Each structure stands twice: as C-alpha cells, then as structure tokens.
C-alpha cells in the first residue's frame, strides 16, 4: 500500500505530469526509451521498433490508465480490481508472453520520462512515492496477468 503522505505527493505531481495531454507525451518517451534500451522488447509488444507509431498510441493509453489509478489510490481494493482487469486482458496482448520481470525496467523509464517533463518537482520524495505507486499499480496488473 501507500501512506497518506505518498498518495498526496503522487496526486499532486500527477497534475504536472498530465500537463495538457493527459500524460500522452510522457507515455511516448517512456515506451520509446524502454524499447531503444531493450531492443528485444519490441517483439513482446507487437512493434517494429521504437519508432513504430503504435508506441505513441500505447504510451497515451498506459499513462491515461495510471491517471485513473491515481484518482482511485484512496480506495486500494478499487484500484487493484481495475488494474487486475487490465492485467487479465494482457494475457492476449503482444507476443502473448508478457512476463512479470519486464515491469521493473519499464518502471524505471516511466520515472525518467516524468522527471523529464516536470524537472525539479520530481524530487527525492516524489520519486519514492511514485516508485511505490508504480509498484502497486503494476503489481495488481501482474496478478491479473497470472490469474
Ligand atoms: C512491459 C509490460 C507491458 C507490455 C508488454 C504491454 C503490452 C501491451 C500491448 C501489446 C497492448 C496493446 C494491445 C492492443 O490493443 O493491441 C497493451 C495495452 C494496454 N496496456 Fe499494456 N503493456 C505493458 C505494461 C503496461 C502497464 C505498466 C500499464 C499500466 C497502466 C499498461 C496499460 C495498458 C492499457 C491501459 C492498455 C490498453 C488496453 C487495455 O485497457 O487493456 N500496460 N499493453
């Protein structure tokens, strides 16, 4: 779970991460940099590479879903139940062999993309709160995936 102070930091900085595009730009950079750094991951997603137009499209949907998860952090069972449902759908996505291990490096590129957009606001406490928030959001998707 998250402490009240962590949910408050996540909720507050999400407003700047969302910007004017509901975080779409952050999603594009996240997935872009992740596949560039890990080339064998293009095949796990159904993409040709980091430049595939599907990267920008999926990047927007990933970040729009985190915005929904952020609006529900105060009710943990609610947030977990909807991320599990996202997770059950992932059984049939990409190469259909999405693994739990892949979410840990993806989380690192997500925090990097966020910091790229909001700069100094993504301080030490913001990074810890978001590493914790990403741990629970992705943790709940993985449990849907392995259900
Ligand atoms: C490295 C792990 C991941 C892989 C390989 C992956 C792969 C995919 C693929 C291939 C699709 C597109 C399916 C299609 O419509 O053709 C998809 C959709 C989606 N992914 Fe993931 N994904 C990953 C992580 C995440 C994370 C961390 C989130 C969390 C917010 C997420 C949220 C979504 C959402 C919201 C969709 C749109 C469709 C739906 O709601 O099920 N994905 N993902």
């Amino acid at each position: 779970g998250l402490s009240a102070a962590q949910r408050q930091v996540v909720a507050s900085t999400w407003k700047d991460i969302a910007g004017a595009d509901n975080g779409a730009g952050v999603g594009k950079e996240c997935l872009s940099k992740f596949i560039s750094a890990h080339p064998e991951m293009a095949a796990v997603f159904g993409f040709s590479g980091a430049s595939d137009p599907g990267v920008a499209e999926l990047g927007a949907k990933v970040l729009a879903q985190i915005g929904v998860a952020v609006s529900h952090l105060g009710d943990e069972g609610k947030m977990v139940a909807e991320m599990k449902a996202v997770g059950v759908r992932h059984k049939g996505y990409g190469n259909k062999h999405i693994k739990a291990e892949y979410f840990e490096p993806l989380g690192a590129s997500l925090l990097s993309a966020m910091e790229h957009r909001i700069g100094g606001k993504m301080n030490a406490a913001a990074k810890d709160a978001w590493a914790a928030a990403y741990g629970d959001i992705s943790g709940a998707l993985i449990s849907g995936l392995q259900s």
Side-chain angles (χ1 to χ4, degrees):
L2 257 66
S3 70
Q6 290 177 129
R7 307 198 302 268
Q8 197 275 307
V9 176
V10 166
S12 176
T13 56
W14 176 249
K15 215 267 183 302
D16 301 298
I17 291 169
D21 62 351
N22 198 205
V26 174
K28 188 195 194 303
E29 190 185 318
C30 171
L31 250 46
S32 181
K33 297 288 195 295
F34 180 50
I35 294 164
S36 301
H38 304 272
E40 73 297 334
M41 289 304 300
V44 185
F45 297 89
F47 304 149
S48 70
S51 290
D52 188 312
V55 173
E57 191 176 11
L58 177 56
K61 299 176 184 179
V62 170
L63 265 285
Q65 187 58 235
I66 285 172
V68 175
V70 171
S71 70
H72 298 161
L73 286 177
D75 184 339
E76 186 178 22
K78 188 180 188 184
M79 185 287 274
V80 173
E82 68 193 358
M83 291 311 304
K84 274 186 183 174
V86 176
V88 174
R89 298 195 297 260
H90 285 59
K91 292 172 177 295
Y93 293 170
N95 72 340
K96 298 177 188 182
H97 293 306
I98 298 172
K99 289 184 184 301
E101 308 90 74
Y102 303 155
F103 290 83
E104 170 63 58
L106 176 61
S109 58
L110 182 62
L111 300 191
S112 185
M114 289 175 167
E115 179 174 24
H116 186 264
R117 177 167 284 181
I118 67 172
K121 289 174 189 174
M122 196 70 175
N123 58 197
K127 284 173 189 180
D128 176 78
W130 266 114
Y134 181 76
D136 287 354
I137 290 165
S138 66
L141 195 163
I142 291 169
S143 70
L145 211 222
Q146 302 177 338
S147 69

